[PDB]
Amino acid sequence: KLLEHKEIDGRLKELREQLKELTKQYEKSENDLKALQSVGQIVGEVLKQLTEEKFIVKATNGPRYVVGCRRQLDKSKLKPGTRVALDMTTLTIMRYLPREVDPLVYNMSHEDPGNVSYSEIGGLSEQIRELREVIELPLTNPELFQRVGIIPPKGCLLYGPPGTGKTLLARAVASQLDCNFLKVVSSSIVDKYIGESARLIREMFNYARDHQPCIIFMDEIDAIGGIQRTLMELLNQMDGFDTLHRVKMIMATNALLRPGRLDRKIHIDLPNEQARLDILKIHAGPITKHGEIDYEAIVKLSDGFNGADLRNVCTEAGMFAIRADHDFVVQEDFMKAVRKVADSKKL
Amino acid sequence: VDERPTEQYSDIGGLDKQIQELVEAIVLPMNHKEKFENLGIQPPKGVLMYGPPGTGKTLLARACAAQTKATFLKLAGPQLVQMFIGDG
C-alpha cells in the first residue's frame, strides 16, 4: 500500500507545482493590467530655467511649453539640454532621461582604451620614440612643465607619405591613456571659413575632458574644407587656453611652423626595406601561411614605399590562393603578387 | 529582382579584370565563406563601380544578378529620397 500512497503523492505534487506556475502566470496577468492604465509621457529638452518652479521645455517635435517640475525631482539634474518626460495633460516635468545617439557623434566621442603594441606598427621605432618624447612628458609631469613656466606643448605634425601608418603611430603611442583618441581628419573644425567650431571645435575638448586622456588627431589637415586666416585664428583660439586632460592635437599630412602654431614636426620616412620585412611579417601574420613561406626576398623585390602596399600584397596573395584549395601561401605566391602590386602601383 | 534578367558574362567585353574582380569580391565570398575564413582574409564589404558614363557598370551588375543565385536587391539613388522626414 506504500507504493500506492507514494503514487498519489506524485499526482498531488504535480498539481502543487502546476498551481504555483499558474499563480506565477496569473501574477503576470495582474501586472500587465496595472501597466495598462499607464499613459505615455512626451519627451522634450529643458531649454532654459525660468525660476525654481518654472521650466521651459521644447517638445521633441512640437511647440515649446513653460512647465514646472513634479516635486520630488532633483532640479540640479534638469539643466539646459537635459531630456525630460513631460506629463501628457499637465505638461509637468516628471522625470529626467539620459541622452544618447546623435548622427554626427560617432568618431568625436568614442573612446578606444585598447592596447596595440608598437610591434603592430613595424619599422617606426624611431618615429614612435618621438611620439612618446612628445606626448609622454606633457601627460606624466605637468608640474615640471608648470614649474618651468611653459604650459602649452601642443601642436605636433606627422607630414610624410600618404597613409603609411600615420593613424597607427597615434595608436601605438596609445599604449598608455589615449582612451578617446578621436579622429577629425580634414573635417569639422574650420571647414574652409569657420564652418565647424565649438559644436565642431569644443564638443571635441568636451568629451576630450569628461573622460580619460584622449588625442584629437586632426589628421590630414591638408584637406580641411576641400581659409588660411581662419585656420590661423583656428589654432590661436581658446584651444590652448584650457588644454584639458593633457589632450594633444596630432595633426599629420604634408610662419605657422613656430611654437604655438605647430610643435615638433616629424617626417615619416618611406618604408625602409629592412623595415619592409617588419611590415610584411606583422601584416602577413594572420593569413594562413605554410612553413616554407619566407618574408626575406619579398622586400628586395617589394619596394612599393606604401604601408597599404604591403597589406594588400599580403591580402592579394590570399586571393591568389582563393583559386585552388591552397590553405597556405607559397614563397612563389608572394613573389607573384609582389611582381604584380609593385608593378601595378606604377599604373 | 523577380524577373531574373539574363546576361551571360560573354556579353561583357573589354572588362575581364573587372568582371573577375567583381565576381571574386561579391560572389566568391558569398557561396564559399568557410574557405575565406580558413585563410582569415577579410572579404571587402562592398564594391563601388566607378567610371566614365556608359563604360558598362550597370551591365556588369546585370550580369552578376543573372549569373548569381543570390537574391539581388536593386535600387536607385533617387528612390531613397522622400519628402517625409526619415522616409529615406
Ligand SMILES: Nc1ncnc2c1ncn2[C@@H]1O[C@H](COP(=O)(O)OP(=O)(O)OP(=O)(O)O)[C@@H](O)[C@H]1O
Ligand atoms: N564593356 C562592355 N561590355 C558589354 N557591353 C557594354 C560594355 N560597355 C558598355 N556596354 C553596353 O553599353 C551600355 C553601357 O551602359 P550600361 O547599361 O552598362 O550602364 P553604365 O555603363 O553603368 O552606364 P551609366 O554610366 O549611364 O550608368 C549597355 O547597353 C551595355 O550593354
Ligand SMILES: Nc1ncnc2c1ncn2[C@@H]1O[C@H](COP(=O)(O)OP(=O)(O)O)[C@@H](O)[C@H]1O
Ligand atoms: N608601418 C605600418 N604598420 C602597420 N600598419 C600599417 C603601416 N603602414 C600602413 N599600415 C596599414 O595601413 C593602414 C593605415 O593607414 P593610415 O596611415 O591611417 O592612412 P592615413 O594616413 O590616410 O590615415 C592600416 O590599416 C594599417 O594596417
Ligand SMILES: [Mg+2]
Ligand atoms: Mg548604372
